[PDB]
Amino acid sequence: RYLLVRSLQTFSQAWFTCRRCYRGNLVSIHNFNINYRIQCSVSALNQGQVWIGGRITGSGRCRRFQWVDGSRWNFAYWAAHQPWSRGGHCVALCTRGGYWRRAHCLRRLPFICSY
């Protein structure tokens, strides 16, 4: 299950909210059918995107893409043209098109929790 939190929060604040207000986690997405369903759930928002639970971790050359809910990173739906290098280490889903974009973790956005 998943739900939309309309409140604007940083990725870290949102990670906390999903865990404490809903006993869940910022959502992980493993296939297009679920990405589309979440896309539909946020289509009418005035904000351009919402936090999902993805993060780029590590230092130096070798890093990893992880879901805060620990699930495997086996699917993505990245916007083809977006600032990438130095674009941020948190992942957001665009309300229009359902594409994912890297975004700076300290920016505040609405978000999706799974429970």
Swiss-Prot record:
Domain of life: Eukaryota
Domain C-type lectin: 1-115
Location(s), subcellular: Cytoplasmic vesicle, Secretory vesicle
Disulfide bonds: 18-113, 90-105
Name this polypeptide is given: Eosinophil granule major basic protein
Encoding gene, per UniProt annotation: PRG2
Full-sequence portion shown in this chain: 108 to 222 of 222
